[PDB]
Amino acid sequence: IETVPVKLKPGMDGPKVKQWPLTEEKIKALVEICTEMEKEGKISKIGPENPYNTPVFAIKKKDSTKWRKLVDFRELNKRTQDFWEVQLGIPHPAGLKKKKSVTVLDVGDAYFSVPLDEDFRKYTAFTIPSINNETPGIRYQYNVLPQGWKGSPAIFQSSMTKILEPFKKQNPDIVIYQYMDDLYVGSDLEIGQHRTKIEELRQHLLRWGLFLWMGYELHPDKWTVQPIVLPEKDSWTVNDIQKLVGKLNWASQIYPGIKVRQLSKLLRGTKALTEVIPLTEEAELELAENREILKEPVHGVYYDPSKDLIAEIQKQGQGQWTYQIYQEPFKNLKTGKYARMRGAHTNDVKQLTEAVQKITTESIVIWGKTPKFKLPIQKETWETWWTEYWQATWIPEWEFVNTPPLVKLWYQ
Amino acid sequence: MVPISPIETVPVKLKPGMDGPKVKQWPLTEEKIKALVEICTEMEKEGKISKIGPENPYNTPVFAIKKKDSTKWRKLVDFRELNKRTQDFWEVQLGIPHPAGLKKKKSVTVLDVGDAYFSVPLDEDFRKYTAFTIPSINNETPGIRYQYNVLPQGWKGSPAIFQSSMTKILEPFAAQNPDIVIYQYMDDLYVGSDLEIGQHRTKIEELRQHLLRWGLTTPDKKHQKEPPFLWMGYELHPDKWTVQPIVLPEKDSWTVNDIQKLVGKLNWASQIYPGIKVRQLSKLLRGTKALTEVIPLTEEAELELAENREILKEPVHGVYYDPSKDLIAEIQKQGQGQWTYQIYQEPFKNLKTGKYARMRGAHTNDVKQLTEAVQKITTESIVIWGKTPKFKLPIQKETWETWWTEYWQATWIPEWEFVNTPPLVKLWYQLEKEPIVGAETFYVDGAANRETKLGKAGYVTNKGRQKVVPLTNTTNQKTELQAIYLALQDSGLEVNIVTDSQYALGIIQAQPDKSESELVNQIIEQLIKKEKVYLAWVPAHKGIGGNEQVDKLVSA
Numbered sequence: 001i002e003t004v005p006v007k008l009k010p011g012m013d014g015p016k017v018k019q020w021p022l023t024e025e026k027i028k029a030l031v032e033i034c035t036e037m038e039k040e041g042k043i044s045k046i047g048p049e050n051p052y053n054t055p056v057f058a059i060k061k062k063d064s065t066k067w068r069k070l071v072d073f074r075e076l077n078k079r080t081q082d083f084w085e086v087q088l089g090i091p092h093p094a095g096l097k098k099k100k101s102v103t104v105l106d107v108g109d110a111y112f113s114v115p116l117d118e119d120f121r122k123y124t125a126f127t128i129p130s131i132n133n134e135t136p137g138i139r140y141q142y143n144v145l146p147q148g149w150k151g152s153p154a155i156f157q158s159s160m161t162k163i164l165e166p167f168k169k170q171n172p173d174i175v176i177y178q179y180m181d182d183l184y185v186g187s188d189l190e191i192g193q194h195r196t197k198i199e200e201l202r203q204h205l206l207r208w209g210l211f212l213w214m215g216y217e218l219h220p221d222k223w224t225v226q227p228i229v230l231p232e233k234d235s236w237t238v239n240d241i242q243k244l245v246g247k248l249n250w251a252s253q254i255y256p257g258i259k260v261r262q263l264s265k266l267l268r269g270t271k272a273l274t275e276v277i278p279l280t281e282e283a284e285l286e287l288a289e290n291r292e293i294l295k296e297p298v299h300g301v302y303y304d305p306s307k308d309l310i311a312e313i314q315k316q317g318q319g320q321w322t323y324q325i326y327q328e329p330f331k332n333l334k335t336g337k338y339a340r341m342r343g344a345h346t347n348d349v350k351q352l353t354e355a356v357q358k359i360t361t362e363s364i365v366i367w368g369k370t371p372k373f374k375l376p377i378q379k380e381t382w383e384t385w386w387t388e389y390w391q392a393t394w395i396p397e398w399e400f401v402n403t404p405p406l407v408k409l410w411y412q
Numbered sequence: 413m414v415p416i417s418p419i420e421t422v423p424v425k426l427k428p429g430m431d432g433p434k435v436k437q438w439p440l441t442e443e444k445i446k447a448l449v450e451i452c453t454e455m456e457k458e459g460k461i462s463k464i465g466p467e468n469p470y471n472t473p474v475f476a477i478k479k480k481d482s483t484k485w486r487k488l489v490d491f492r493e494l495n496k497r498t499q500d501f502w503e504v505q506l507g508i509p510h511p512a513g514l515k516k517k518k519s520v521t522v523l524d525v526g527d528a529y530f531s532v533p534l535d536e537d538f539r540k541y542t543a544f545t546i547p548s549i550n551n552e553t554p555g556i557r558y559q560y561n562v563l564p565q566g567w568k569g570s571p572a573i574f575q576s577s578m579t580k581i582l583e584p585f586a587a588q589n590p591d592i593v594i595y596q597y598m599d600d601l602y603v604g605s606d607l608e609i610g611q612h613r614t615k616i617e618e619l620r621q622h623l624l625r626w627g628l629t630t631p632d633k634k635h636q637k638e639p640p641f642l643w644m645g646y647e648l649h650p651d652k653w654t655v656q657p658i659v660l661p662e663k664d665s666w667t668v669n670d671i672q673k674l675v676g677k678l679n680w681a682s683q684i685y686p687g688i689k690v691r692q693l694s695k696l697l698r699g700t701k702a703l704t705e706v707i708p709l710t711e712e713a714e715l716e717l718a719e720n721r722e723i724l725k726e727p728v729h730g731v732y733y734d735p736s737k738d739l740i741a742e743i744q745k746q747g748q749g750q751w752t753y754q755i756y757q758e759p760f761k762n763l764k765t766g767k768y769a770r771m772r773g774a775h776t777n778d779v780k781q782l783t784e785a786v787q788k789i790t791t792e793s794i795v796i797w798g799k800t801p802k803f804k805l806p807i808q809k810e811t812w813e814t815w816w817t818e819y820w821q822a823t824w825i826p827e828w829e830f831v832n833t834p835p836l837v838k839l840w841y842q843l844e845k846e847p848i849v850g851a852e853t854f855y856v857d858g859a860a861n862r863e864t865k866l867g868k869a870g871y872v873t874n875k876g877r878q879k880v881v882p883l884t885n886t887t888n889q890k891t892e893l894q895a896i897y898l899a900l901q902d903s904g905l906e907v908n909i910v911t912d913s914q915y916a917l918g919i920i921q922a923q924p925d926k927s928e929s930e931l932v933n934q935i936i937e938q939l940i941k942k943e944k945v946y947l948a949w950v951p952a953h954k955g956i957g958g959n960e961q962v963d964k965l966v967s968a
């Protein structure tokens with residue numbers, strides 16, 4: 001009914017992406033889920049004349065007994081046309097990040113109400129593998145807007161608008177933002193009735209047609225940043241001064257006015273690393289001038305919607321992780337630190353996977369897009385484990401860092 | 413007649429912008445022509461091909477070849493051109509099962525489905541592209557033109573479409589008979605089960621009746637194939653599996669091609685025979701690529717070869733998978749970046765074995781390699797069994813804990829226990845987190861002239877100890893490492909070292925226990941002898957005491 005024509009971008013074929021190995025429990029889950037989707041008309045079995053593939057796996061969101069199918073559409077998304085057709089795109093709301101509470105809803109099930117263009121369905125092909133390839137993999141494609149595909153929120157947008165219209169007119173101060181399968185709803189209300197307002201929202205979706213009941217509570221107004229701070233000490237060792245001059249040298253790339261000359265003079269001669277050195281007056285003045293410089297914002301920092309966001313992460317030890325989001329080197333758009341647990345105390349890779357998810361969430365809230373990650377992990381280790389910890393319905397792009405950054409110690 | 417269910421055709425297209433083949437038919441001898449006409453007349457009467465009119469523009473060449481040293485002929489249609497122009501397909505069978513993931517079976521029966529193999533209909537709209545021409549006797553009449561109504565042998569889409577069609581037919585049978593397994597390859601259909609023999613035979617008769625729904629007839633005379641089966645380089649038996657015989661040739665002289673074949677056999681053998689090593693043999697294959705060249709075997713390659721011969725002296729078999737039991741994976745370090753592993757359920761009976769080799773890299777260490785081996789085995793295990801094995805690893809729990817908590821990267825290995833089975837993986841050194849009180853402090857530097865390759869490396873200390881060494885044929889990076897080496901060599905058991913070298917810090921922060929670099933190896937050997945080492949970095953050219961003084965010394 002009223003199918004929107006969709007195309008790949010010029011000169012591109014559909015995705016052929018290998019299905020990665022799935023555990024028995026994930027395969028069983030996916031067989032059950034897909035058997036039901038097939039009965040409901042959402043997917044159909046396909047024949048050998050469809051060469052395309054996109055990987056699929058299954059996740060369990062936070063505190064739930066049910067598996068959720070997750071298709072990794074990253075390749076299809078790159079290869080799918082940008083949508084200029086009717087809408088020129090929404091300006092990203094700048095007020096969302098200022099709200100006291102933002103709840104995240106998974107609305108993706110609504111997409112299944114819209115048929116997918118018959119000519120484009122083949123590009124949604126996916127396979128449920130069998131253990132040890134003992135039986136033929138089960139091959140399906142979508143008949144309707146799939147969750148995880150960038151085209152789905154685009155094509156459904158005129159429907160979502162009508163759905164939320166009474167809630168928006170009734171609650172003009174509440175910010176609603178849609179990214180992929182997620183709806184982000186912010187408000188300044190007391191948490192008890194914020195929760196009522198979102199539940200009021202759920203009903204509009206629940207009443208219309210047909211994991212929605214879930215919600216993920218954020219408080220972005222309390223989100224912090226990490227300015228460059230220098231130690232305040234009564235006695236400085238040679239080693240302390242060396243680390244200070246190192247950190248200032250690094251900072252001077254970000255802040256031009258930074259000077260190390262007087263501090264660098266302090267160590268004069270070759271002294272024991274642990275020896276205490278009294279600061280000269282010139283050294284104290286310089287340090288003071290440097291502190292004041294570091295209280296000001298970085299010069300010439302601006303977000304460009306046309307450039308990728310890059311996120312770097314450092315493992316600081318004891319469950320602590322620092323990160324920076326930028327576009328251009330030394331102009332950081334956001335920095336942050338997670339000192340936290342949420343299980344994972346004996347698992348580094350789980351911690352990193354949770355950090356990646358938290359950073360991507362912040363990115364979506366602030367800029368409305370996901371960044372490209374530089375991960376401090378060996379590719380094979382990440383690729384083996386990340387799907388075990390993944391609770392998000394989207395997936396960002398990543399690359400791997402194999403050389404230890406010297407700058408880790410300065411974000412500590 | 414008994415109505416039969418038609419096989420639904422798969423719609424097929426040429427690649428975008430491509431037309432069908434038009435390829436000249438080469439002349440044939442009068443004999444070949446008579447043979448092809450007969451062959452095609454038979455094929456045509458059973459409906460496999462049909463005569464076509466002059467209007468079809470397409471052509472694919474046809475040949476007449478022979479069976480083995482005798483009188484009979486076979487038709488070969490060369491589809492190379494049509495294949496280039498045909499769309500890609502999804503093949504159900506690719507990524508074959510590993511025997512180690514199979515389940516033991518009391519009975520395995522084989523059925524002959526060769527008549528289905530040649531009977532699957534081809535999409536009506538695509539048939540025209542399959543056109544071929546038997547040349548006329550003497551070229552005095554139009555050649556006889558035919559096209560295919562069924563999947564042709566040699567055509568790009570035949571295997572995928574045959575597999576998909578057979579799958580669709582078998583699916584309801586398999587689904588409603590969870591007590592059997594089925595596998596189909598070419599003209600054979602295999603059915604295994606644990607059923608009482610009476611029940612098993614009944615199942616086979618039911619399958620035969622099922623297949624009859626599509627008109628596929630299975631010869632009543634029973635199959636001459638029974639276990640053990642030779643399949644895909646393996647031997648499958650009802651209760652055990654192995655690789656087909658591996659016999660290592662004797663020769664006084666070895667050739668590139670001979671060595672490649674040897675390594676190939678050894679790699680194949682390594683999935684069952686524990687402890688197979690290819691390092692020194694694959695080493696002889698480096699960067700040559702002239703297949704007739706004779707390479708003298710190193711003493712190391714000879715040792716490896718003899719070690720392999722002993723491993724291969726008598727047959728070894730794997731058992732099959734029991735889903736009711738835990739999978740255990742045990743790994744051993746073999747030296748030279750080589751690792752070996754066994755996967756088992758009950759002690760002393762392996763499901764399979766295998767090996768892992770260290771990645772190409774400038775610097776490395778045993779803990780990283782063991783971690784890599786674990787992730788590889790983990791991924792293989794997910795493929796074969798759908799679950800991660802519990803690991804038995806030659807590294808102490810305390811060693812692992814010290815490693816991962818201090819390593820600059822996130823790292824993880826899944827549930828595992830220490831097995832004390834030398835050689836053990838250990839940390840050969842760990843650097844201090846804070847400067848050492850009472851330890852001498854060495855400020856090191858090195859520099860080289862990029863033109864002449866002359867350089868200097870050295871240190872100065874808080875005790876007034878100093879050294880500068882002149883160096884030739886060196887680089888700034890090498891001099892920076894040489895300076896750290898000198899400080900290690902000349903200091904006591906506890907030492908603080910201050911360097912400006914980001915290059916050296918990056919190497920040392922990677923924690924190598926072994927290097928392609930001679931100098932890094934010497935540094936590692938010295939670190940191993942220390943009780944405590946603190947390594948401090950400072951930026952160059954900043955006026956940092958002991959750093960200039962040594963920087964100035966080493967510059968000129």
Ligand SMILES: Cc1cc(/C=C/C#N)cc(C)c1Nc1ccnc(Nc2ccc(C#N)cc2)n1
Pocket residue numbers: 134509513514515516517520593594595602603604639640641642643648649650651
């Ligand atoms: C992959 C496969 C190849 C062949 C046959 C290929 C050929 N030629 C026969 C069968 C039935 C299967 N499929 C499965 C599936 C699950 N367990 C098993 N176990 C199993 C198979 C054969 C023997 C024996 N002998 C024992 C156990 N086979």
Ligand SMILES: CCOC(=O)c1cnn2ccccc12
Pocket residue numbers: 134135136504505574575576578579580582583586593594595596597
């Ligand atoms: C055509 C190839 O079919 C199979 O090998 C096969 C193995 N299990 N199985 C179950 C249903 C259908 C086909 C199969």
